[PDB]
Design a protein around this ligand. Sequence first.
Ligand SMILES: NC(=O)c1ccc[n+]([C@@H]2O[C@H](COP(=O)([O-])OP(=O)(O)OC[C@H]3O[C@@H](n4cnc5c(N)ncnc54)[C@H](OP(=O)(O)O)[C@@H]3O)[C@@H](O)[C@H]2O)c1
Ligand SMILES: NC(=O)c1ccc[n+]([C@@H]2O[C@H](COP(=O)([O-])OP(=O)(O)OC[C@H]3O[C@@H](n4cnc5c(N)ncnc54)[C@H](OP(=O)(O)O)[C@@H]3O)[C@@H](O)[C@H]2O)c1
Lengths: 253, 254
Amino acid sequence: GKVILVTGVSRGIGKSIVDVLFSLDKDTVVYGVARSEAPLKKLKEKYGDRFFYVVGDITEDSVLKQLVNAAVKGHGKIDSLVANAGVLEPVQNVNEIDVNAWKKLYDINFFSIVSLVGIALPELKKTNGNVVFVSSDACNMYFSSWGAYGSSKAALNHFAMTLANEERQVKAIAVAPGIVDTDMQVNIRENVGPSSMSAEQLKMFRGLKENNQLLDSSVPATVYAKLALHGIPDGVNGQYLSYNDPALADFMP
Amino acid sequence: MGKVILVTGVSRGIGKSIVDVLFSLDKDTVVYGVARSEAPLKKLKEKYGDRFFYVVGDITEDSVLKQLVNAAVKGHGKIDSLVANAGVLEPVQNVNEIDVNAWKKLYDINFFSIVSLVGIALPELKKTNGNVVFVSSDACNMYFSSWGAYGSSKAALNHFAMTLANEERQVKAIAVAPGIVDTDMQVNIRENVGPSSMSAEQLKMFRGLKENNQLLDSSVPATVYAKLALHGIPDGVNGQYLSYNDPALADFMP
Ligand SMILES: NC(=O)c1ccc[n+]([C@@H]2O[C@H](COP(=O)([O-])OP(=O)(O)OC[C@H]3O[C@@H](n4cnc5c(N)ncnc54)[C@H](OP(=O)(O)O)[C@@H]3O)[C@@H](O)[C@H]2O)c1
Ligand SMILES: NC(=O)c1ccc[n+]([C@@H]2O[C@H](COP(=O)([O-])OP(=O)(O)OC[C@H]3O[C@@H](n4cnc5c(N)ncnc54)[C@H](OP(=O)(O)O)[C@@H]3O)[C@@H](O)[C@H]2O)c1
């Protein structure tokens, strides 16, 4: 009866993370959070007493404490925390940077999680649970106009390594899902791509779709689900890996 | 004349020593510094004269960043390098005692203030094929106890050096760590924030580092940051993260 908290579960990898979690087990309870009310009420209508949703922006700590205390006031237990919520904008070249937009990007993919763990860490230590970060391949690779988003996940990799080395009662990990057929790649192909992104990387993100090499949302979500359901191995605690790493072969579909 | 360099945090530690080395190897270089303490800046003005200019204020405000860049073009007409030597260690705290508002102010000094200054000066940096030098730290890769916000902010700055060097081929960015230097920050580690938020084993590593005379003088790494701004960043290490004593950065050593 593991209690798993997942962020941004209204679309993309988030909604599938709770979909795979409800497929491998029938006693696991998931507390989700997002900003769109319609797709979150559909998840509870579909799963009933196994899913509970909080509609709000993770940048507001008022709804972060709403998500954590609801799991304690509902089940008195906090096992896993999968940080699967983030934005991509601002997608802009270094010659056209808005710093206040960069902090807005950092307040969702990094500062939102540092505050989220600090609120749920006392409950996570009581179960010796796992903290799984949903990182990205842009933390060590160059991507055009991804200066904010690329360094966004690089700081998450450091926060994953620091958390695993500081409080060893819990275990932290940061795993990149690769390239997944979500609405983010839709934004890369039909909006922020032709505007500010270059030509070489753009035709790659679009050529990888027509030839059908884009992963479905449930392929990497199964890795984050099993890592949140069975636990993180000891030899990879705090490291940064990808979903298809041989060390995580026991978490593949 | 020669080149014009912009160095941040020219008050304490390494930032002041970078100014001393830049004037030590050249006589045409003029440095435009910025810092919040007027006491050590007005002293550097009377030591070098018309080779040094300063702006008193915090780098978190864009009005100070623009006042430093605009003064460098109305005075000498160009900007040839950028030395981002401004950082803060606090808040040092445990994961169970995290203050998010205090974590942001570190990022707004060590990261968001730098990414704001690079773009304001980017139109001038590209006109001279300049070199942007980032002063990072060893905490971007290794783990340090309770160095949560500091170690993670250097990791974001290192990625920005690679992004800046790959997007604008007219500029050259690098992120060099000075190792562990005998500055005012290491004094704060062994005495202030040490017996407060950090472990015991890592402090016996840092306090034993001073008792072993292993603390580098700020003259050694500042020479690497200064020579990289004068002679320029090589192409074989453009956008990478290195240390001061890297074999690729040997020609920038004293
Ligand atoms: N797709 C890829 O190629 C790829 C690659 C590398 C990493 N990732 C990472 O995988 C994770 C999910 O994939 P995705 O981004 O592609 O799916 P997505 O559909 O683009 O969005 C992911 C979720 O994040 C939620 N979210 C964003 N900001 C929020 C906020 N301020 N408050 C509450 N919820 C918020 C969104 O819910 P609402 O819309 O309702 O606010 C959304 O459901 C992301 O973290 C992404 O960085 C994806
Ligand atoms: N010393 C080491 O062992 C070590 C190791 C790794 C990396 N580093 C990095 O090397 C750089 C300098 O070394 P240090 O930290 O040891 O010297 P330091 O004695 O700690 O002084 C830090 C400098 O940054 C300036 N500064 C900080 N915030 C500022 C702001 N908001 N506006 C303007 N100036 C500001 C300070 O000037 P004011 O206080 O007057 O404003 C000061 O000149 C730092 O970035 C540090 O992260 C140092």
